[PDB]
């Protein structure tokens, strides 16, 4: 049908504009922040992908949780996640954000940031390299590319 074609091209357009202009809010919790800063450094250079460096949380597209999530800061993580406008995404980076990591059996560590916020991309490593974090961000962009909001809206 015609309207299916129109909403397919409109999904392609809005998915292009949302994946080619991702603005990250980076939680600099622990050692993974250093490798995020290397992913922003001139070698790997997030900014050429449209991924800007240190946007504010109230206009960011993706929350990168980069480091250990302790019990003392889990409500602050959820609060900053709730202040993010939609569509918001969460990238988990490194082992402590993913599943607790080297502090999995700790009394004071949230065992994975997916007990707190919904996580889209799990980037593994300790720390994952800046090239590996950039691979995870490009896989996030591909996940945004195959979204079907207006196609499902026309079919609902």
């Amino acid at each position: 049908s015609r309207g299916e074609y129109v909403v397919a091209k409109l999904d392609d357009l809005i998915n292009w504009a949302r994946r080619s202009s991702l603005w990250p809010m980076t939680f600099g919790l622990a050692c993974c922040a250093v490798e995020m800063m290397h992913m922003a450094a001139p070698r790997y250079d997030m900014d050429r992908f449209g991924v800007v460096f240190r946007a504010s949380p109230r206009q960011s597209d993706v929350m990168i949780v980069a480091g250990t999530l302790t019990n003392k800061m889990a409500p602050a993580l959820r609060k900053v996640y709730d202040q993010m406008p939609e569509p918001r995404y969460v990238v988990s980076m490194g082992s402590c954000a993913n599943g607790g990591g080297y502090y999995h059996y700790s009394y004071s560590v949230v065992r994975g940031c997916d007990r707190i916020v919904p996580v889209d991309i799990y980037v593994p490593g300790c720390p994952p390299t800046a090239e590996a974090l950039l691979y995870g961000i490009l896989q996030l962009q591909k996940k945004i590319k195959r979204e079907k909001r207006l196609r499902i809206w026309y079919r609902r």
């Binding site: 504009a17 202009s21 001139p42 250079d45 206009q59 406008p85």
Partner: protein, 311 residues
């Protein structure tokens, strides 16, 4: 016909503001030993379009506002004053050719602080109001030296006419007799637009959604490009053949782009002033030299018999 002239003024203003963001990200790329955007478009040319469509379909931030009226009128005033600063600018010919275009631009630039003040009070955050009051105090501080430097240069112009300011500089750039005025004017226009190293708001409109925040952003870059064009006309004014206006148009365009790149090249070089440090810079460094040079530029066309013509 005149409406076509108004639209061909105000639509390429918005296009040049859209691509100033790309030029800024590219220049601050290559000055920071990296690349700017080059993936989204061919050489990154689709980055402003992708950015604008991202900001315009984002969820609204849904603020609780102290006012509806000022919360809506602050972007409207910001964009209206950002577009109406372009109408007396000779490029070589202005849209609205008036006798007092310099004083017109000084007045309409003094009116731009109400956007900051209304958007700061129309947010419920007290920190946003403190940042907005500090930005308003900064802007009204540097408007003083804007007015006095502008007056001293127009003592060499002869009138408040902006088209006479091209006739004034036919034999020499006006940066040569007025380079201390030119450098204090340049830093003062840098401190008008909350531009680095004077950007304390990045170190007042955090309650707006992504759309209206983009509107404030594009009004701010319209102000940046406009004050660079005004500085170009006022100190580095180009040759004007009346039979071929494209010579002056190409020339002031190249100089204005180099001056906007100089803004981008200054923000990639310096740390931020602390607030009382740039208050010290205005009220205790720029203002005494500005007053002394105002006395000099009053008494100098009289002592040289170089009083400029009234008409």
């Amino acid at each position: 016909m005149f409406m076509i002239n108004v639209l061909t003024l105000i639509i390429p203003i918005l296009l040049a503001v859209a691509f100033l963001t790309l030029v800024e990200r590219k220049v601050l790329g290559y000055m920071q030993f990296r690349k700017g955007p080059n993936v989204v478009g061919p050489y990154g040319l689709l980055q402003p379009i992708a950015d604008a469509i991202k900001l315009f379909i984002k969820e609204p931030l849904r603020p609780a506002t102290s006012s509806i009226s000022m919360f809506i009128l602050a972007p409207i005033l910001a964009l209206t004053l950002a577009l109406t600063m372009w109408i007396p600018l000779p490029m070589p010919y202005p849209l609205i050719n008036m006798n007092l275009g310099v004083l017109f631009m000084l007045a309409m630039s003094s009116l731009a602080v109400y956007s900051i003040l209304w958007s700061g009070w129309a947010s419920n955050s007290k920190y946003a109001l403190i940042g907005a009051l500090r930005a308003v105090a900064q802007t009204i501080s540097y408007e003083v030296t804007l007015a006095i430097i502008l007056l001293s240069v127009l003592l060499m112009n002869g009138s408040f006419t902006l088209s006479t300011l091209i006739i004034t500089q036919e034999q020499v750039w006006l940066i040569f007799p007025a380079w201390p005025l030119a450098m204090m004017w340049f830093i003062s226009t840098l401190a008008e637009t909350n531009r680095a190293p004077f950007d304390l708001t990045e170190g007042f409109n955090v309650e707006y959604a992504a759309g209206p925040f983009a509107l404030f952003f594009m009004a701010e870059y319209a102000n940046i490009i406009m004050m660079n064009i005004f500085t170009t006309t006022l100190f580095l004014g180009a040759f004007h053949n009346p039979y071929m206006p494209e010579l002056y148009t190409i020339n002031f365009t190249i100089k204005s782009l180099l001056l906007s790149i100089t803004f981008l090249w200054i923000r990639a070089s310096y740390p931020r002033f602390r607030y009382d440090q740039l208050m010290h810079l205005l009220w205790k460094n720029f203002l005494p030299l500005t007053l002394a040079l105002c006395m000099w530029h009053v008494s100098l066309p009289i002592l040289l018999s170089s009083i400029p013509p009234q008409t």
